[PDB]
Scaffold this active site. Structure first.
Site, mmCIF file in Angstrom:
data_model
loop_
_atom_site.group_PDB
_atom_site.id
_atom_site.type_symbol
_atom_site.label_atom_id
_atom_site.label_comp_id
_atom_site.label_asym_id
_atom_site.label_seq_id
_atom_site.Cartn_x
_atom_site.Cartn_y
_atom_site.Cartn_z
ATOM 1 C CE1 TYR A 1 -2.178 -3.331 2.526
ATOM 2 C CE2 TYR A 1 -3.530 -2.738 0.646
ATOM 3 C CZ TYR A 1 -3.210 -3.612 1.663
ATOM 4 O OH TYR A 1 -3.928 -4.772 1.823
ATOM 5 C CE1 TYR B 1 -7.362 -6.143 3.227
ATOM 6 C CE2 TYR B 1 -6.376 -7.835 4.628
ATOM 7 C CZ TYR B 1 -6.354 -7.064 3.482
ATOM 8 O OH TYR B 1 -5.301 -7.202 2.605
ATOM 9 C CG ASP C 1 -10.734 -14.486 6.839
ATOM 10 O OD1 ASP C 1 -9.739 -15.018 7.405
ATOM 11 O OD2 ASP C 1 -10.627 -13.554 6.014
ATOM 12 C CE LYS D 1 -2.437 -11.600 8.727
ATOM 13 N NZ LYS D 1 -2.532 -12.027 7.303
HETATM 14 C C1 LIG Z 1 -8.746 -11.940 8.273
HETATM 15 C C2 LIG Z 1 -7.817 -11.913 7.082
HETATM 16 N N1 LIG Z 1 -8.105 -12.581 5.943
HETATM 17 C C3 LIG Z 1 -7.331 -12.602 4.838
HETATM 18 C C4 LIG Z 1 -6.125 -11.937 4.799
HETATM 19 C C5 LIG Z 1 -5.265 -11.981 3.558
HETATM 20 O O1 LIG Z 1 -4.034 -12.641 3.908
HETATM 21 P P1 LIG Z 1 -2.693 -12.501 2.995
HETATM 22 O O2 LIG Z 1 -2.114 -11.145 3.274
HETATM 23 O O3 LIG Z 1 -3.015 -12.651 1.515
HETATM 24 O O4 LIG Z 1 -1.763 -13.632 3.403
HETATM 25 C C6 LIG Z 1 -5.650 -11.192 5.985
HETATM 26 C C7 LIG Z 1 -4.394 -10.405 5.884
HETATM 27 N N2 LIG Z 1 -3.987 -9.588 6.767
HETATM 28 N N3 LIG Z 1 -2.870 -8.905 6.509
HETATM 29 C C8 LIG Z 1 -2.498 -7.880 7.285
HETATM 30 O O5 LIG Z 1 -2.921 -7.724 8.428
HETATM 31 C C9 LIG Z 1 -1.666 -6.799 6.633
HETATM 32 N N4 LIG Z 1 -0.485 -7.327 5.901
HETATM 33 C C10 LIG Z 1 -2.566 -6.025 5.647
HETATM 34 C C11 LIG Z 1 -2.708 -4.525 5.888
HETATM 35 C C12 LIG Z 1 -1.837 -3.657 6.550
HETATM 36 N N5 LIG Z 1 -2.314 -2.373 6.547
HETATM 37 C C13 LIG Z 1 -3.494 -2.288 5.901
HETATM 38 C C14 LIG Z 1 -4.384 -1.256 5.615
HETATM 39 C C15 LIG Z 1 -5.556 -1.520 4.899
HETATM 40 C C16 LIG Z 1 -5.859 -2.810 4.462
HETATM 41 C C17 LIG Z 1 -4.994 -3.876 4.728
HETATM 42 C C18 LIG Z 1 -3.822 -3.644 5.433
HETATM 43 C C19 LIG Z 1 -6.571 -11.152 7.153
HETATM 44 O O6 LIG Z 1 -6.280 -10.523 8.298
#
Ligand SMILES: Cc1ncc(COP(=O)(O)O)c(/C=N/NC(=O)[C@@H]([NH3+])Cc2c[nH]c3ccccc23)c1O
Ligand SMILES: Cc1ncc(COP(=O)(O)O)c(/C=N/NC(=O)[C@@H]([NH3+])Cc2c[nH]c3ccccc23)c1O
Ligand SMILES: [Mg+2]
Ligand SMILES: [Mg+2]
Lengths: 422, 420
Positions: free
Chosen positions: A19, A151, A242, A271
């Site tokens: 981002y 999310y 999720d 994760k």
């Molecule tokens: C419940 C759940 N379901 C699916 C996924 C996808 O998972 P993946 O990333 O494809 O492995 C995750 C990933 N969470 N990721 C993070 O918290 C940060 N890296 C994102 C992140 C950091 N500032 C942000 C500001 C706005 C939006 C996103 C972010 C998840 O929490």
């Protein structure tokens, strides 16, 4: 080899960050050179300093970094078999991990689809739901319903169920209002009425149970999940949880669904699954979902990543899961939550602070204005803590190995950035 | 701990396999227990047997399994730092790998976005194209164009550019690109693109070789035509090199056969030498700067395990191992061995075509290949082959000796003989 100055030069010219922009970064990234236990070694002004990983590297490092049992599992597997294709072959790490995940997840989830990331595992769960209804002869059941604040990842389908205002909104999905923290049956009655109107076009409800992470670190009463389970059952809509952020003990239960004693039809985990070593995710589904997909005219789930069920990632996940279950993890999380509660209490009285909340090993200070990272990050680093605020939130999800003293240092740093916001 | 018999029991009860059912699989998986160099140890009738990994574990194991340089790069990094979040932090493995990838890829590709899988890297490339045109004030430029025969992954946006015959966004498809160069095909592609240019963000294709869609080859001059058409009609060109990269087609990247540089490129698979999942999307500075200056101000993507240090460190070693040797001569010799070994298949009655491109060898058959016959036939000859549709094919590790290549091709010819 590269010096830290050369790393920053290459980074600024050639590396995208999450981002972020290229060349417009108001704050340039900090070089990390080592990680061990709960500590990162970062370069600050050309000097290496150790700081607490208060975020567990985005929920992943539940046992800390470089834990000897996880390192050894990885090196053991590496000496035997790095990777083989999962098309027509199987192996012991996948089988051990699948057996473990089936035994510890909510009852009824008995099949496991491995993928490489959380966003892909969410897309597999959606594909499972859609192929399920096609297998039932109801191909109009094509849309997803969720509540605001969520999310679910960054792929195009995952984005369609992310909170629309926290995603600059793709498939047009159904959104219920933000679920409140305290239990209000009127909320559930309205969710039902909204779902009822769409039931004929809905394949699934998809939600993060109890804790909504990246969308706002909001908590909700688990009784809402019993209501969703019941609504989904009565209207012939699948329920998908999720648990990619909430799994493996983080909220005080092994999976957040366990706070409510409900089993979804499909569940995603990731994760902390690998202890933060390697990318791995899994989508679990019930026997009924699996049999319905397999008996449909399609006959098979049309998904198969190249690195599916990678032996190295599975082997370290087995070790990480066993390490958690072999200890009194429930007491460990309760002590972490008590430490966060005591450390963050000072923040309740601060003038810029709107709310302080703790759930398991998750602590949150919500402020009345955006926190400026140009101020928050140096303030926290001066106190030996790596924090990454976002929007109006200062939050922590610390490794389960943090001592009481480390929790005091983390919470003291959070309170101080909250104090600086006002 | 589990014996092979117990592995098969757990597997059948609890594990989904790629593109499969639960409980309806006519063929159950074989247990793999070790891999070293070009060889797998599999369990057959309760006994371990050594067989050649003729598929390089789905195109990934270009240096074979358990190579000492890659094992050691991984253990060296493991002792320092397993993983840190890429939000607000950077590190030496990501920087070393980005620097390498920018220098060895087609000219002008100067920024690198790491992700965890090929499918995700394809969606990142689509997101780059769409955000690019929004940053130019042309948000109607929203669709993708490709030719038939392609495969780009299993996520929902990637599926939308898969060959429709082999809920999704409706993309623009040109006909199957032929093998031999025909200027009429390029003229027709151009005429079709011209009708949609105002709504097209990008052309996305696999250059020279279309893998999962049929192992079809096409003349590299078609890519010179696509580059020119895209430039003249203001459409971005995206190459998906997730299967063709890192020397497989005889050039370092298949685009090099044409001397063309796309605006955006995806790489994966052989990037890590088959150890760990990693993929990358590269774009030109112009694309990057337009996105960064757009109203968005940023590329709105960021996976949790972005730029994982362990995966980056092993990829750095794999790429340097490839560049540090005369890989071009190695691939030419491998291609010569495949050609020589597969020549006998041309005259077989069920064989429609035999074709070789770099370290890729294909026998195309006149009927779908029955895995229940092909798999034991190949294992009986000490080779692990995985046919699909009507293809018997190999993409062997670059470390295979001449004798091992002959053993592989002899096994391919014999399953082709069994098809008819
Ligand atoms: C419940 C759940 N379901 C699916 C996924 C996808 O998972 P993946 O990333 O494809 O492995 C995750 C990933 N969470 N990721 C993070 O918290 C940060 N890296 C994102 C992140 C950091 N500032 C942000 C500001 C706005 C939006 C996103 C972010 C998840 O929490
Ligand atoms: C150019 C390109 N772009 C993107 C991706 C997605 O990448 P990812 O899987 O998400 O990491 C890939 C992945 N190719 N994968 C394979 O060829 C294997 N599944 C073998 C495979 C190919 N046909 C099959 C038919 C049946 C069974 C197995 C296979 C790619 O070649
Ligand atoms: Mg169970
Ligand atoms: Mg596709």
């Amino acid at each position: 080899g590269l010096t830290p100055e050369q790393i920053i030069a290459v980074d600024g010219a050639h590396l995208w960050h999450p981002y972020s922009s290229i060349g417009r970064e108001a704050v340039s990234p900090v070089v990390a050179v080592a990680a061990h236990g709960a500590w990162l070694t970062l370069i600050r002004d050309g000097q290496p300093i150790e700081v607490l990983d208060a975020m567990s590297s985005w929920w992943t490092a539940i046992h800390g970094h470089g834990h000897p049992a996880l390192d050894q599992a990885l090196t053991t597997q590496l000496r035997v078999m790095n990777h083989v294709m999962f098309g027509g072959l199987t192996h012991e790490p996948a089988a051990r991990l699948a057996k473990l995940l089936v035994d510890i997840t909510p009852a009824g989830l008995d099949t496991v689809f491995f993928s490489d990331s959380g966003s892909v595992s969410v897309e597999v769960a959606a594909k499972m739901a859609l192929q399920y209804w096609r297998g039932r002869g109801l191909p109009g059941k094509r849309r997803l319903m969720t509540w605001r604040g969520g999310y679910h990842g960054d792929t195009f389908l995952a984005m369609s169920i992310c909170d629309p205002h926290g995603g600059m909104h793709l498939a047009a999905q159904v959104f219920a209002p933000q679920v409140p923290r305290d239990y209000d049956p009127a909320y559930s009655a309205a969710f039902e009425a909204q779902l009822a109107q769409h039931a004929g076009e809905l394949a699934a409800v998809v939600v993060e149970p109890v804790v909504q992470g990246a969308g706002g670190m909001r908590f909700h009463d688990p009784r809402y999940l019993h209501d969703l389970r019941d609504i989904c059952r009565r209207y012939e809509v699948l329920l998908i949880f999720d648990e990619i952020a909430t799994g493996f003990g983080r909220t005080g239960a092994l999976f957040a669904a366990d706070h409510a004693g409900v089993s979804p039809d499909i569940m995603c985990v990731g994760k902390a699954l690998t202890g933060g070593y390697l990318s791995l995710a899994a989508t679990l589904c019930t026997a009924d979902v699996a049999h319905t997909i397999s008996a449909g005219a399609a006959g098979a789930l049309m998904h198969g990543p190249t690195f599916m069920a990678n032996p190295l990632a599975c082997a370290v996940s087995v070790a990480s899961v066993e390490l958690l279950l072999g200890q009194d993890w429930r007491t460990r999380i309760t002590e972490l939550a008590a430490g966060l509660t005591a450390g963050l209490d000072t923040a309740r009285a601060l003038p810029a602070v709107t709310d302080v909340r703790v759930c398991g090993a998750i602590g949150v200070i919500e402020c009345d204005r955006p926190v400026d990272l140009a101020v928050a990050t140096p303030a926290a680093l001066d106190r030996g803590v790596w924090l990454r605020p976002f929007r109006n939130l200062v939050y922590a999800m610390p490794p389960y190995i943090c001592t009481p003293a480390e929790i005091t240092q983390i919470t003291s740093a959070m309170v101080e950035v909250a104090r600086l916001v006002g």
